């Protein structure tokens, strides 16, 4: 089956944070968890990652935790918890970095981590089938529909979207060199 402790701890973290957003309001939690909006804040190191935990609607957190539990679960089960931790930490850091550049510091959501998992699971399952991981054609369809819809603003954090994807592809490429 699928139930890794990293998978579930991320799901719980996200839900705990989202409960807090509901009691305190978004901005209040945003003021503490969002990417540093002022260089003076730059040594508040949690912020480079914590933006990933914030969600701005129930639909967003469910949809994201679905993808996370599905693709995240698969990575933890087949490749270990350490691999899931690293993809998570790198993609959260890098998609937030790019996202801040694209449109400043007010954003959140696990969807950059998710696009990194999509990138990773797909390329890894392509170049390296024995990993026991793969992304289906229907889901890479929807992923592609999902990015470009963010371009055309019908998925708002585009730098996050494209950043995360890139990160997952690159790491899967690296990991698929090694066998």
């Amino acid at each position: 089956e699928r139930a890794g402790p990293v998978t579930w701890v991320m799901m719980i973290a996200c839900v705990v944070v989202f409960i807090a957003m509901q009691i305190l309001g978004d901005q209040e939690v945003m003021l503490w968890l969002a990417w540093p909006f002022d260089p003076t804040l730059k040594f508040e190191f949690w912020r480079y990652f914590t933006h990933a935990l914030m969600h701005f609607s129930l639909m967003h957190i469910l949809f994201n935790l679905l993808w996370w539990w599905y693709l995240g679960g698969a990575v933890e089960k087949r490749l270990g918890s350490g691999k899931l931790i690293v993809i998570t930490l790198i993609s959260a850091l890098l998609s937030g970095y790019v996202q801040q550049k694209f449109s400043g510091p007010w954003f959140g959501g696990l969807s950059g981590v998710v696009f990194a998992l999509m990138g990773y699971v797909w390329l890894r399952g392509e170049r390296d089938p024995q990993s026991g991981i793969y992304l289906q054609r229907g889901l890479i369809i929807f992923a592609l529909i999902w990015i470009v819809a963010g371009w055309f603003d019908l998925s708002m954090a585009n730098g996050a979207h494209i950043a995360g994807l890139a990160v997952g592809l690159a790491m899967a490429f690296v990991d698929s060199l090694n066998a």
Binding site: F107, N158, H161
Partner: peptide, 4 residues
Amino acid sequence: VRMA
């Protein structure tokens, strides 16, 4: 706010 943009949503990732």
